[PDB]
Amino acid sequence: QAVFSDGAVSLHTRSLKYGKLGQGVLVQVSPSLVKRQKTHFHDLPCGAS
RNA sequence: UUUUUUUUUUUUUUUUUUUUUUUUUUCUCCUCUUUUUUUUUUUU
């Protein structure tokens, strides 16, 4: 949502695609291998998202 | 003879801890010559 005065970040969930997630797996990598785009949500035609 | 409207200095604070100088090496190593050893004694 906005940037605080000491580098803190406030985040909001004011939409329909945002909120608590369900089942799946999580993979954590360095935050420099992700390419900037305009659609970070994907529905890959393989059987998963 | 030139009207009307365009917000602004991050929210939070009432957290526990039962130790003690230093600290850790260096090897074996030819001693030259008048001697037995003098000696009581007294004046401090």
UniProtKB/Swiss-Prot annotation:
Component of the RNA exosome core complex (Exo-9), composed of EXOSC1, EXOSC2, EXOSC3, EXOSC4, EXOSC5, EXOSC6, EXOSC7, EXOSC8 and EXOSC9; within the complex interacts with EXOSC4 and EXOSC7. The catalytically inactive RNA exosome core complex (Exo-9) associates with the catalytic subunit EXOSC10/RRP6. Exo-9 may associate with DIS3 to form the nucleolar exosome complex, or DIS3L to form the cytoplasmic exosome complex. Exo-9 is formed by a hexameric base ring consisting of the heterodimers EXOSC4-EXOSC9, EXOSC5-EXOSC8 and EXOSC6-EXOSC7, and a cap ring consisting of EXOSC1, EXOSC2 and EXOSC3. Disulfide bonds: none annotated. The gene is EXOSC2. It comes from the Eukaryota. The chain holds residues 146 to 194 of 293 of the full protein. It is found in: Cytoplasm; Nucleus, Nucleolus; Nucleus. This is Exosome complex component RRP4. Belongs to the RRP4 family. The lineage of its organism: Eukaryota, Metazoa, Chordata, Craniata, Vertebrata. Non-catalytic component of the RNA exosome complex which has 3'->5' exoribonuclease activity and participates in a multitude of cellular RNA processing and degradation events. In the nucleus, the RNA exosome complex is involved in proper maturation of stable RNA species such as rRNA, snRNA and snoRNA, in the elimination of RNA processing by-products and non-coding 'pervasive' transcripts, such as antisense RNA species and promoter-upstream transcripts (PROMPTs), and of mRNAs with processing defects, thereby limiting or excluding their export to the cytoplasm. It is linked to Short stature, hearing loss, retinitis pigmentosa, and distinctive facies: An autosomal recessive disorder characterized by childhood myopia, early onset retinitis pigmentosa, progressive sensorineural hearing loss, hypothyroidism, short stature, brachydactyly, recognisable facial gestalt, premature ageing and mild intellectual disability.
